[PDB]
Design a protein that fits this description.
The protein has one domain (1-309): Jelly Rolls (Sandwich). The chain is 24% helix and 22% strand. The protein has 9 helices and 14 strands. Strands 1-2-12-9-14-7-6-4 form an 8-stranded mixed beta sheet. A 4-stranded antiparallel beta sheet has the order 8-13-10-11, covered by helices on one side. It has a two-stranded antiparallel ribbon with strand order 3-5. Helix 1 links the parallel strand 1 (11-12) and strand 2 (38-41). It is globular and about 55 Å long. The structure holds the ligand O=C(O)c1ccnc2cc([C@@H](OCCN3CCC(F)(F)CC3)c3ccccc3Cl)[nH]c12 and manganese (II) ion. Manganese (II) ion (MN) is lined by residues 204, 206, 212, 292. 2-oxoglutarate binds at residues 136, 212, 214, 222. Residues 164-309 form the JmjC domain. Residues 9-50 form the JmjN domain.
Length: 309
């Protein structure tokens, strides 16, 4: 009945020598990590970049997420107007996020086990008797208020001890993003995610089957699920069988907007699924054509970008 957590994805703790070049390190761990779709990378203990976003002016209107919107398809009066719209600052969103989680679980936010949030999230996704609605500060461009990493673009002050992180190859602004093609000779910045408890992203792969790298700057963990690329067709077949028939004929780019599926359903159909809790200061790398999904344990701040090799 209750959710069965998938097996854990690989976690790498590179030494300072191995941490010199990201693409070199990802290329070496590839024989294992590409068989799990996702992997987690813990930087050395003394690698701690500062938070370089413009906090005072950081404002956004998050998207409203109804956890059980797909199950509800199986209409309500005045549908399409369920939730009033709120604009937040970073502070007011965190106050809302902490108040929501502490009130939902009736305990301090840091005392809620990650396994309980995970079990409750997937129960609410399939629940028709309880309509839980959360908000997600998703797809906030790093050009709006700056990246979470320090950037030497002469827009915000950089301290001498912070210049190492502005020049680091693990700075998401310094990842290679230019794909090779003939059209590139004839003729992208990171995105930010401000999460709260139960805010989520559904199953998808990246454009051009690209790699992606994800960094959690601060906050409560982000729970991930990943499927290796050799099982990509198996996942799409399970979707074709069990996803809502009204969305069956939709192209992949549109279907991926609502490809919500319990990982146990995929595992029951023979699809290998791996999980991880990405904590503050840790990287998550997704490999080409590796389907991934997840949700946030609480108030946190993430940065993500697609990169090419
Ligand atoms: O939230 C995280 O941590 C996280 C980690 C990894 N991948 C994702 C992907 C997303 C979301 O956007 C995907 C599509 N957009 C990607 C960025 C873009 F600029 F190209 C514009 C299109 C999303 C997807 C499905 C349902 C809800 C949400 Cl919110 N969130 C992720
Ligand atoms: Mn993604």
């Amino acid at each position: 009945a209750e959710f069965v957590p998938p097996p854990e994805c690989p976690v790498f703790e590179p030494s300072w020598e191995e941490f010199t070049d990201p693409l070199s390190f990802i290329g070496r761990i590839r024989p294992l990590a590409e068989k799990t779709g996702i992997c987690k990378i813990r930087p050395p203990k003394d690698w701690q970049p500062p938070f370089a976003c413009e906090v005072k002016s950081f404002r956004f209107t998050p998207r409203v997420q109804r956890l059980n919107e797909l199950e509800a398809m199986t209409p309500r009066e005045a549908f399409g107007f369920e939730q009033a719209v709120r604009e937040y600052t970073l502070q007011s969103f965190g106050e809302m996020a902490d108040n929501f989680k502490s009130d939902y679980f009736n305990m301090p936010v840091h005392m809620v086990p990650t396994e309980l949030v995970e079990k409750e999230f997937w129960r609410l996704v399939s629940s028709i008797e309880e309509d839980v609605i959360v908000e997600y500060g998703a797809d906030i461009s790093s050009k709006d208020f700056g990246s979470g990493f320090p950037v030497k673009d002469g827009r915000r002050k950089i301290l001498p001890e912070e210049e190492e992180y502005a020049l680091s190859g693990w700075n998401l602004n310094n990842m290679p993003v230019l794909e090779q093609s003939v059209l590139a000779h004839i003729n992208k910045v990171p995105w930010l995610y401000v999460g709260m408890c139960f805010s989520s992203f559904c199953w998808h792969i990246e454009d051009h089957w690209s790699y992606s790298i994800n960094y959690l700057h601060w906050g409560e963990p982000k729970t991930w699920y990943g499927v290796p690329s050799h099982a990509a067709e198996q996942l799409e077949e399970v979707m074709r069988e069990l996803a809502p028939e009204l969305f069956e004929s939709q192209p992949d780019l549109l279907h991926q907007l609502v490809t919500i599926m319990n990982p146990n359903v995929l595992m029951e159909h023979g699809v290998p699924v791996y999980r991880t809790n990405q904590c503050a200061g840790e990287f998550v790398v997704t490999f080409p054509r590796a389907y991934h999904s997840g949700f946030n344990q609480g108030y946190n701040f993430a940065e993500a970008v697609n990169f090419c090799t």
